[PDB]
Structure formats: structure tokens, C-alpha cells
Design a protein around this ligand. Structure first.
Ligand code: AR6
Length: 360
């Protein structure tokens, strides 16, 4: 029902980390250790896929990565955090509204079927000393455009390759909507300077891998505000920058961009996710707030992850937990605590040749 993806570089980091845990050169963080203790095998006796799944399973339904983490053995180590930020997840979804924040959403008369790809952006904020992503892309506290290009390339390429093959298997092209990933909460002190960097990072990936993405046609980038409305042609792809608060009538994220439709294109939206949380994040707590929480609440994301069938509330634009649970603490996070649900699924990685395959 959901699929975890990662780059070649991320699998090399899992491999190194697994080796170090076997050799005694590393010790696991508190939350990864808790998930290992719920299982019988040791680090040495486990395969790389089981190891990867248990590290991903340390994610909690709700965690604010920018403010609630210490980046040490008390929660998640800088090593685990390096791996976790690179993990993305995708799932097919029924989109019930266009994704408008607050009361602005428009309900789909007939729910649209598409896909969500949850990808964490550069974590450049912290309430406890520098993050793994701050160490990588910052040179003396200044944003490095080329290091940011490398980070987003590593995170977004496994999903871009995944949806390119899916659109070829469906005989359609791809229409992908992308928000201003890493430009809000995760930008920290760089809030006033980050928007051009994320837009240039997306241009860079699509310019680099255009030969590997033929069945990808529309890229609709909506950073809400702080970017000039523009149309750019990257090879065969059309990259559009249409900030909703700048360009009135902009197509919503969970809606078909202009020049795409259900018969010619498959609809994919990127979701600005968190290193340490389950896909919905804030919406596990009932709040339809961030890009992450608005997109999970506006789709059946919670139904995909928990396996339960919820009920869409047209007035609040939220996918609510089953009536049988609530009749009796009734948000989606309490549903998972009541039923013992864990975030654990299949995981694929890009190999040397640039294709997705098993981790063993
Ligand atoms: N009313 C609005 N309507 C539409 N878009 C908005 C609005 N306000 C801001 N945006 C834009 O929505 C875009 C994304 O901003 P963010 O949601 O913070 O994403 P991140 O990657 O920085 O932080 C990830 C964390 O936030 C989640 O909790 C996750 O689970 C993580 O914890 C920005 O371009 C905004 O300008």
C-alpha cells in the first residue's frame, strides 16, 4: 500500500551504519533501539532490508524535526538523521479536495485518484545545535547552491524515476505538483533567502536527469509566495512556477495542472515531509495545517498507512477516523496507538545503473 524509496548514497550510509553497529564503532539512538528491542534478531543476524525498515519504523506519527530533536543518542543520532532525511515514501491516493489551506480548499465533485510522494526537505532549523543537513549544505552559515542541489537530487530522484516508469506502464505522461519544500518551517534563519535556492535545485535535477525522465511532462511548482511567476522549458518538460498568493486562480496541488487531464496524465504531488515522522505528521493530531498535514488530511493517506477506511468530511476538508473508533482521544494517532500500527513497508533503492531494485 506504500513504498519507501532511497538513493544509492543513502543505501551506502545504511550499509556503513549497519557495519559500524556490528563492529562496535557506533551505538544506536534511543528510538531506533526501542524498535530493535521489539524484535528477536540481532543487528548482525538481520539483512539490510529489515535493518532499514526498523530504522524507518523509529519515526513517530507526530514529531517536529526542527524543534523537538537533540541530534544525539537521546533521540536520533546525526548518523540516523542523515539516512532518515533521504527516505521518501509514495502511495496511491484518492484526493478529496484541491489541497487549499484553511477554508480555501475546493472539494472534488468526484474524488481524483493520484499519487503522493512524501520527501523531507533540508532541515536548516534546530532547537538543539546543528543538524546533519546544516552540516552538509552550509559553508560558514551561508547557503551553498551546489550542496543543496546534491541533497535534493538524492531525495527527489528515486521518486522521479519511480513515477517515470509508472506513467510509461500506465500509457500516460506525468503531471507533478511540487510545493516550496524546505522553504517554510525547515528553512530556519534562511527563510528570507531560501526560495530561489529550492527553485534552482529543482531546475538542476530536471536539467541533469531529463534523458532519464521521458514520460514526465508537467512540473507545476507552487512556492505560495516569494518567487517570480515563470514558464521554463527543460528539454521536453514544462516547468512552471506559479505561486498561489501571487497568481490568482493557480491550480491547487491536488489538482491537474493546466494542459494535463485524467486521460492523458497521471497526477503526482510531492509532499514536504519530516525526517522523523510518519507521512501525515501534524494531521495524526487532527490538525490540517502544513503542506504535509493539509495533503494527508485532504487525501486517504491515513487509510493507506493504517489500512482502516476513514470518512471524508466535506465541510472541514479532512479524512476522519472510522466511525466505529470515534463513537467511544479520537484522532488518527490514537487509532494507531489503540491498534498497534507501525510505519513499516517495502523499500527499494537506486542502484549504480540508475534503476530501482531490492536492497539485498
Ligand atoms: N496558507 C498557505 N497556503 C498554502 N501554502 C502555504 C501557506 N502558508 C505557507 N505555505 C507554503 O507551504 C510550503 C511548505 O512549507 P512547510 O509546510 O512549512 O514545509 P517545510 O519543508 O519547510 O517543513 C517541513 C515541516 O513542516 C511539516 O510539519 C512537516 O511534517 C515537517 O515537519 C511553503 O512554500 C509555504 O510558503
Amino acid at each position: 500500500a506504500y513504498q519507501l524509496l532511497l538513493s544509492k548514497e543513502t543505501l551506502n550510509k545504511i550499509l556503513q551504519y549497519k557495519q559500524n553497529l556490528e563492529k562496535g564503532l557506533a551505538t544506536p539512538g534511543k528510538f531506533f533501539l526501542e524498535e530493535l528491542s521489539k524484535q528477536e534478531k540481532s543487528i548482525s543476524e538481520m539483512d539490510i532490508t529489515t535493518f532499514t525498515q526498523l530504522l524507518i519504523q523509529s519515526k513517530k506519527p507526530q514529531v517536529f524535526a526542527e524543534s523537538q530533536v537533540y541530534h544525539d543518542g537521546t533521540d536520533w543520532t546525526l548518523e540516523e538523521e542523515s539516512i532518515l532525511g533521504d527516505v521518501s515514501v509514495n502511495m496511491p491516493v484518492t484526493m478529496y479536495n484541491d489541497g487549499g489551506h484553511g477554508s480555501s480548499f475546493k472539494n472534488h465533485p468526484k474524488p481524483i485518484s493520484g499519487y503522493l510522494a512524501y520527501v523531507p526537505g533540508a532541515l536548516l532549523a534546530s532547537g538543539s545545535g546543528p543538524t546533519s543537513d546544516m552540516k552538509e549544505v552550509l559553508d560558514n552559515g551561508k547557503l551553498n547552491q551546489d550542496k543543496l542541489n546534491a541533497l535534493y537530487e538524492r531525495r527527489l530522484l528515486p521518486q522521479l524515476i519511480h513515477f517515470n516508469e509508472l506513467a510509461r506502464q500506465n500509457e500516460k505522461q506525468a503531471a507533478i505538483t511540487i510545493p516550496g519544500i524546505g522553504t517554510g518551517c525547515f528553512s530556519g534563519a534562511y527563510y528570507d533567502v531560501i526560495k530561489p535556492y529550492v527553485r534552482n535545485a529543482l531546475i538542476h535535477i530536471l536539467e541533469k536527469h531529463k534523458d532519464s525522465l521521458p514520460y514526465i511532462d508537467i512540473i507545476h511548482y507552487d512556492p505560495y509566495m516569494g518567487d517570480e511567476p515563470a514558464e521554463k522549458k527543460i528539454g521536453h518538460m514544462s516547468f512552471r512556477v506559479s505561486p498561489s498568493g501571487v497568481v490568482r486562480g493557480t491550480t491547487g496541488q491536488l489538482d491537474y495542472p493546466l494542459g494535463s487531464n485524467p486521460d492523458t496524465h497521471i497526477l503526482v504531488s510531492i509532499v514536504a515531509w519530516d525526517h522523523f515522522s510518519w507521512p501525515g505528521n501534524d494531521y495524526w493530531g487532527g490538525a490540517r495545517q502544513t503542506d504535509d498535514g493539509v495533503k494527508a488530511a485532504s487525501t486517504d493517506t491515513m487509510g493507506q498507512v493504517t489500512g482502516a477506511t476513514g470518512v471524508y468530511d466535506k465541510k472541514w476538508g479532512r479524512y476522519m477516523p472510522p466511525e466505529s473508533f470515534t463513537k467511544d482521544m479520537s484522532d488518527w494517532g490514537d487509532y494507531v496507538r489503540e491498534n498497534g500500527i507501525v510505519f513499516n513497508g517495502p523499500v527499494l533503492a537506486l542502484d549504480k545503473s540508475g534503476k530501482l531494485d531490492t536492497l539485498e
